[PDB]
Symmetry: D2
Subunit: 139 residues, 4 copies
């Protein structure tokens, strides 16, 4: 419904080769008509120095997810999307397991996209909430 | 002036072992009475899938830098600091070289710290601006 | 369910006397177990100079609504709540009618609250999305 | 220097007639080659119900100031500017006197502008910091 390109999880994951998403173990997990989901491990790759998930790593996940979502929503033969503004509240710390982000659209305009991204640890309790504004730019 | 613990760059860099900062090559570079500076490479470790610096990686740098700055400003025998809210505008893309962040204090309160963090590529032009709110929490 | 103090719309409205909410015609309209709703006129009181709803006025509505929601959730004999951080995306312009905001909780912690606030004009299309962080402060 | 149209404080003030800025007593006060300054009373017009400056009112001031700054920087025969994203940290409460905002440019791009807006009460201590993203839109 939301998507122009039907998401293919294998393809999404493969596109990350040689980029931070691959390095951090970000995995696109699921999608439906209204959302796209990706997860990331909470370990030494994503920890800050006191053994908690680094808040910036949560934002890497959010922006990876939202950027990919935007990519799937535009005519890629005429446009590309880059992040313009991002913000996040850090709600709960995580030490282990994985953190899962779900992206939903707030607004898909001609020049900007705004995504609502909700993160939670394996216990299912909200860990982070982010909002991401993407600029839509002519090729 | 700002600092409680005088920053020692060697020590800052070493504290990152086995955390994302180490993995991404974040390097604490300089400090003075009013600021703390760190840089990060722009390469396959920090790229998004189209060869640009991932916006989330800019935020990892900003939050690494600001969190460390907060750590240096509190009585660590009674308090620790965790990120509470972060936001950033993405101003210009970067493809190579390093991105350098400079953190300056907006407000150091008893329960929150607010940091102004300015990022730029090797050409010196502003690439990202972030603001980070840290919560100050009793041990 | 969310609430400690059961919302009473008359008191909420009456409490705005001699404050900006009264000046701008903010009206608390509705509530349920999970949300609180207020609306505001789009007119000369809330316009910017070009005849569109001022983006700051959208934020006054959001912050009025979320701050009141926080007040209804804390023990007011021991605590009061103040805005700590606010952010908003301006999605669509509005010229007339009313703008309606709905607040839902993202997280009610011991020291901070985070509210999701969605605004729309009379056509029902999203016009602004805000996120508000409140500090919970001992009297 | 920053400016395309040279700021004229009388016109800026006069232009607010029949809009929220006039209602709240926003006064454009000063400018130089790099900044624009406006102030606002802290009184019943701008209070929240507990007698503190409403955090949204701080944002009205910031967005009025930054939007006017954008208008003075674009070619107004081809473009107009609207708020796209705004965020603020509320640093200190204010009860009386005036709050003064100073706007400085972070980035004036072709399609977006980013403004740094610093607010303080009459004691000169930082009371709020805002960042505003404006969209540049063809007429």
């Amino acid at each position: 419904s939301l998507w122009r390109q039907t998401p293919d999880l294998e393809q999404l994951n493969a596109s990350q080769k040689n980029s931070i998403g691959d390095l951090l173990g970000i995995r696109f997990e699921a999608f439906d008509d209204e959302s796209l989901t990706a997860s990331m491990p909470v370990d030494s790759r994503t920890h800050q120095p006191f053994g908690l998930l680094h808040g910036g790593a949560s934002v890497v996940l959010a922006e990876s997810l939202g950027s990919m979502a935007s990519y799937l929503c535009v005519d890629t033969s005429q446009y590309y999307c880059v992040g313009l503004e991002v913000n996040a509240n850090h709600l709960r710390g995580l030490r282990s397991g994985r953190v899962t982000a779900v992206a939903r659209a707030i607004h898909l305009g001609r020049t900007t996209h705004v995504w609502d991204i909700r993160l939670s640890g394996d216990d299912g309790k909200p860990s982070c909430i982010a909002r991401l504004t993407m600029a839509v730019v002519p090729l």
